[PDB]
Design an enzyme around this catalytic site. Structure first.
Site, PDB file in Angstrom:
ATOM      1  N   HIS A  61     -15.028  -2.027   5.117  1.00 13.99           N
ATOM      2  CA  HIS A  61     -13.702  -2.624   5.200  1.00 13.99           C
ATOM      3  C   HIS A  61     -13.754  -4.125   5.391  1.00 13.99           C
ATOM      4  O   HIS A  61     -12.866  -4.831   4.905  1.00 13.99           O
ATOM      5  CB  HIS A  61     -12.897  -2.012   6.364  1.00 13.99           C
ATOM      6  CG  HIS A  61     -12.930  -0.516   6.400  1.00 13.99           C
ATOM      7  ND1 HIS A  61     -12.330   0.264   5.435  1.00 13.99           N
ATOM      8  CD2 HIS A  61     -13.473   0.338   7.296  1.00 13.99           C
ATOM      9  CE1 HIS A  61     -12.517   1.540   5.728  1.00 13.99           C
ATOM     10  NE2 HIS A  61     -13.210   1.612   6.851  1.00 13.99           N
ATOM     11  N   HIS A  91     -14.769 -10.633  12.674  1.00 12.98           N
ATOM     12  CA  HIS A  91     -14.765 -10.328  11.254  1.00 12.98           C
ATOM     13  C   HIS A  91     -13.632 -11.120  10.626  1.00 12.98           C
ATOM     14  O   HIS A  91     -12.855 -11.791  11.311  1.00 12.98           O
ATOM     15  CB  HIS A  91     -14.551  -8.833  11.005  1.00 12.98           C
ATOM     16  CG  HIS A  91     -13.249  -8.356  11.538  1.00 12.98           C
ATOM     17  ND1 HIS A  91     -13.093  -7.922  12.831  1.00 12.98           N
ATOM     18  CD2 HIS A  91     -12.016  -8.342  10.983  1.00 12.98           C
ATOM     19  CE1 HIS A  91     -11.825  -7.621  13.043  1.00 12.98           C
ATOM     20  NE2 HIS A  91     -11.146  -7.903  11.943  1.00 12.98           N
ATOM     21  N   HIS A  93     -10.589 -11.149   7.222  1.00 11.20           N
ATOM     22  CA  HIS A  93      -9.806 -10.566   6.143  1.00 11.20           C
ATOM     23  C   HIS A  93      -9.590 -11.674   5.121  1.00 11.20           C
ATOM     24  O   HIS A  93      -9.367 -12.837   5.508  1.00 11.20           O
ATOM     25  CB  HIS A  93      -8.438 -10.074   6.645  1.00 11.20           C
ATOM     26  CG  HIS A  93      -8.545  -9.124   7.800  1.00 11.20           C
ATOM     27  ND1 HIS A  93      -8.474  -7.755   7.644  1.00 11.20           N
ATOM     28  CD2 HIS A  93      -8.760  -9.340   9.122  1.00 11.20           C
ATOM     29  CE1 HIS A  93      -8.651  -7.165   8.825  1.00 11.20           C
ATOM     30  NE2 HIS A  93      -8.816  -8.105   9.748  1.00 11.20           N
ATOM     31  N   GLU A 103      -3.634 -12.012   7.199  1.00 10.47           N
ATOM     32  CA  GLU A 103      -2.806 -10.895   7.656  1.00 10.47           C
ATOM     33  C   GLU A 103      -1.533 -11.421   8.297  1.00 10.47           C
ATOM     34  O   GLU A 103      -0.431 -11.143   7.832  1.00 10.47           O
ATOM     35  CB  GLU A 103      -3.630 -10.050   8.632  1.00 10.47           C
ATOM     36  CG  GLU A 103      -4.862  -9.458   7.974  1.00 10.47           C
ATOM     37  CD  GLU A 103      -5.272  -8.152   8.580  1.00 10.47           C
ATOM     38  OE1 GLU A 103      -5.651  -8.150   9.765  1.00 10.47           O
ATOM     39  OE2 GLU A 103      -5.244  -7.117   7.865  1.00 10.47           O
ATOM     40  N   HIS A 116     -10.792 -12.880  12.951  1.00 10.28           N
ATOM     41  CA  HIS A 116     -10.419 -12.116  14.142  1.00 10.28           C
ATOM     42  C   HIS A 116     -11.617 -12.052  15.073  1.00 10.28           C
ATOM     43  O   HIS A 116     -12.605 -11.383  14.753  1.00 10.28           O
ATOM     44  CB  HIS A 116      -9.983 -10.701  13.772  1.00 10.28           C
ATOM     45  CG  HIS A 116      -8.674 -10.670  13.069  1.00 10.28           C
ATOM     46  ND1 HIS A 116      -8.218  -9.585  12.349  1.00 10.28           N
ATOM     47  CD2 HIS A 116      -7.727 -11.626  12.980  1.00 10.28           C
ATOM     48  CE1 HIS A 116      -7.037  -9.883  11.849  1.00 10.28           C
ATOM     49  NE2 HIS A 116      -6.712 -11.112  12.224  1.00 10.28           N
ATOM     50  N   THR A 195      -5.038  -4.020  13.105  1.00 11.09           N
ATOM     51  CA  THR A 195      -4.477  -4.146  11.763  1.00 11.09           C
ATOM     52  C   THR A 195      -5.096  -3.172  10.768  1.00 11.09           C
ATOM     53  O   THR A 195      -4.727  -3.197   9.594  1.00 11.09           O
ATOM     54  CB  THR A 195      -4.620  -5.573  11.250  1.00 11.09           C
ATOM     55  OG1 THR A 195      -6.017  -5.864  11.153  1.00 11.09           O
ATOM     56  CG2 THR A 195      -3.924  -6.581  12.151  1.00 11.09           C
ATOM     57  N   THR A 196      -6.048  -2.355  11.193  1.00  6.60           N
ATOM     58  CA  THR A 196      -6.536  -1.227  10.414  1.00  6.60           C
ATOM     59  C   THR A 196      -6.411   0.044  11.234  1.00  6.60           C
ATOM     60  O   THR A 196      -6.324  -0.007  12.465  1.00  6.60           O
ATOM     61  CB  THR A 196      -8.007  -1.366  10.018  1.00  6.60           C
ATOM     62  OG1 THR A 196      -8.806  -1.458  11.198  1.00  6.60           O
ATOM     63  CG2 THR A 196      -8.252  -2.545   9.143  1.00  6.60           C
TER      64      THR A 196
HETATM   65  O1  LIG Z   1      -8.664  -4.961  10.980  1.00  4.94           O
HETATM   66  C1  LIG Z   1      -8.784  -5.077  12.107  1.00  4.94           C
HETATM   67  N1  LIG Z   1      -9.410  -3.875  12.800  1.00  4.94           N
HETATM   68  C2  LIG Z   1      -9.702  -3.979  14.303  1.00  4.94           C
HETATM   69  C3  LIG Z   1     -10.346  -2.885  14.869  1.00  4.94           C
HETATM   70 CL1  LIG Z   1     -10.727  -1.440  13.875  1.00  4.94          CL
HETATM   71  C4  LIG Z   1     -10.743  -3.007  16.177  1.00  4.94           C
HETATM   72  C5  LIG Z   1     -10.249  -4.064  16.946  1.00  4.94           C
HETATM   73  C6  LIG Z   1      -9.638  -5.151  16.325  1.00  4.94           C
HETATM   74  C7  LIG Z   1      -9.328  -5.097  14.996  1.00  4.94           C
HETATM   75  S1  LIG Z   1      -8.438  -6.307  14.361  1.00  4.94           S
HETATM   76  O2  LIG Z   1      -7.030  -5.898  14.585  1.00  4.94           O
HETATM   77  O3  LIG Z   1      -8.749  -7.577  14.980  1.00  4.94           O
HETATM   78  N2  LIG Z   1      -8.403  -6.306  12.782  1.00  4.94           N
HETATM   79 ZN   LIG Z   2      -9.119  -7.872  11.727  1.00  6.63          ZN
END
Ligand SMILES: O=C1Nc2c(Cl)cccc2S(=O)(=O)N1
Ligand SMILES: [Zn+2]
Ligand SMILES: O=C1Nc2c(Cl)cccc2S(=O)(=O)N1
Length: 257
Positions: A61, A91, A93, A103, A116, A195-196
């Site tokens: 992802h 990570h 996006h 996002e 993020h 957000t996932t």
């Molecule tokens: O895509 C995202 N997935 C997350 C997961 Cl699975 C864990 C924690 C934080 C995030 S995030 O909301 O920062 N963006």
């Molecule tokens: Zn994220």
């Protein structure tokens, strides 16, 4: 399984994850004229000097740079937060084109990408417990625009060839996330979600006003990653962003006038 394609993307997620239609979903559009300055918000404290990065993983992802979170080494405090939140991973996006990828949006503007930096509230003991709590996570979100290169991103870019496909990981020690921050820590904040999937409503979002600049070559290399595993048909890892969700009964607060 959920993803970002036409048949498993954000508009489908609610069937397996009904909280997708919940009361505090993320991301959101940040309407800058409606966000209220809150003078009681404190400056952010970002303490990354002792950060210990370990590994970089393509999870199908995004790619996650993971940190040792077994001690208070890299922590986020202050701002809207009560207590101490430990960095576990970061990570991004990003889009297929420079005109999309973030996002969160700012007055409906989409940036080329969004970083993020994910932290969990130490009062809950571990990340898995923290995500079950309304104040369990603090995510520091940073927008990326295309222009000059970000020198502190290059070490990330240069390892991506080694984690092209889902499930691949590589050692990634001694990476300093301070090199990914903009100059100003002015921010907007609101209560939201992952957000996932599983889309848990456990995040205090802290979104920095100042974007960082990355080069076209840097983001082009993000776009050479694959959603698929090795030996499967190649599907480029692009447009791994969820669009803005309804704000509902929430207020976005600004740390700055
Ligand atoms: O895509 C995202 N997935 C997350 C997961 Cl699975 C864990 C924690 C934080 C995030 S995030 O909301 O920062 N963006
Ligand atoms: Zn994220
Ligand atoms: O300032 C704006 N930026 C946009 C981006 Cl970047 C993408 C889509 C739509 C918009 S917008 O036209 O609503 N207004």
């Amino acid at each position: 399984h959920w993803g970002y394609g036409k048949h498993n993307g954000p508009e489908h997620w609610h069937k397996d994850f009904p909280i997708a239609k919940g009361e505090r979903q993320s991301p959101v559009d940040i309407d800058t004229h409606t966000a209220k300055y809150d003078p009681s918000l404190k400056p952010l404290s970002v303490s990354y000097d002792q950060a210990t990065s370990l590994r970089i993983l393509n999870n199908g992802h995004a790619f996650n740079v993971e940190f040792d979170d077994s001690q208070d080494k890299a922590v986020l405090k202050g701002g809207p937060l009560d207590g101490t939140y430990r960095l576990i991973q970061f990570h991004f996006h990003w889009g297929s084109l420079d005109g999309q990828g973030s996002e969160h949006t700012v007055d409906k503007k989409k940036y080329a990408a969004e970083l993020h930096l994910v932290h969990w509230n130490t009062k809950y003991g571990d990340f898995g417990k923290a995500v079950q709590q309304p104040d369990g996570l603090a995510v520091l979100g940073i927008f990326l625009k295309v222009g000059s290169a970000k020198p502190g991103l290059q070490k990330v870019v240069d390892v991506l060839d080694s984690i092209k496909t889902k499930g691949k990981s590589a050692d990634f020690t001694n990476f300093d996330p301070r090199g990914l921050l903009p100059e100003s820590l002015d921010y907007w904040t609101y209560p939201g979600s992952l957000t996932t999937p599983p889309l848990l409503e456990c995040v205090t979002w802290i979104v920095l006003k100042e974007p960082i600049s990355v080069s076209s070559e840097q983001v082009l290399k993000f776009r050479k990653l694959n959603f698929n595993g090795e030996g499967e048909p190649e599907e480029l890892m692009v447009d791994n962003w969820r669009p803005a969700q309804p704000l509902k009964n929430r207020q976005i607060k600004a740390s700055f006038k």
